[PDB]
UniProtKB/Swiss-Prot annotation, chain B:
This is SURP and G-patch domain-containing protein 1. Component of the spliceosome. Detected in adult testis and heart, and in adult and fetal brain, kidney and skeletal muscle. It comes from the Eukaryota. It is found in: Nucleus. Plays a role in pre-mRNA splicing.
Length: 122, 119
């Protein structure tokens, strides 16, 4: 976009990085609905549920990896940050964390995402 | 004297702010009880009632959101939610991870409805 004042350049980047933050939230939200439906019919039929969960785990990592390039210690106390980074690391290296630690992690990126959004729209 | 259009704009706006504020207030009360719990485990149980009344405020947050819910959880996640909501209502103590997944879920539920209003 052409000849923007330093003012205008700033209001546009704010509006745009706020909108893509929203979009990323809706596309992650939507992705998870997609996996849910597949599980829900997978039972409407052994290892199906293992790869569904492993695929869901891959989606949540890339959701997390998206989140980091929008900005992380901002949002967590120290105890929860290293548990956080252990899981992230584990998912990043293709190993499959403990199912309740992964669920703690899914919810925490979701949570941080919403917190980032609301710190833009307010 | 405001139009319908105008009259409903503010009550929308007021209700958005009404619960944004409601979120920050609960948010800062968790930040408060974390810090007290932090220095409670520095010196050394005092750690425990600190966990206990933290739990008893998240159960209050939940209680306050619901007054304004299966709209956010598939039935699997929904029942694990309701069991652990019940246990805190009855002074039980769920195992830590169960309570964690509960605190995070209600937090996300509050974030979600503030969004339906704002977007």
């Amino acid at each position: 976009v052409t000849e923007l004042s330093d003012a205008q350049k700033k209001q546009l980047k704010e509006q745009q990085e706020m909108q893509q933050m929203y979009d990323m939230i809706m596309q992650h939200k939507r992705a998870m609905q997609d996996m849910q439906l597949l599980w829900e019919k997978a039972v409407q039929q052994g290892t199906w549920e293992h790869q569904l969960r492993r695929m869901e785990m891959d989606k949540t990592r890339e959701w997390a990896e998206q989140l980091t390039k929008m900005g992380i210690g901002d949002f967590l106390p120290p105890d929860e940050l290293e548990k956080f980074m252990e899981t992230f690391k584990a998912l990043k290296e293709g190993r499959e964390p403990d199912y309740s630690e992964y669920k703690e992690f899914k919810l925490t990126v979701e949570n941080i995402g919403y917190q980032m959004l609301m710190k833009m729209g307010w």
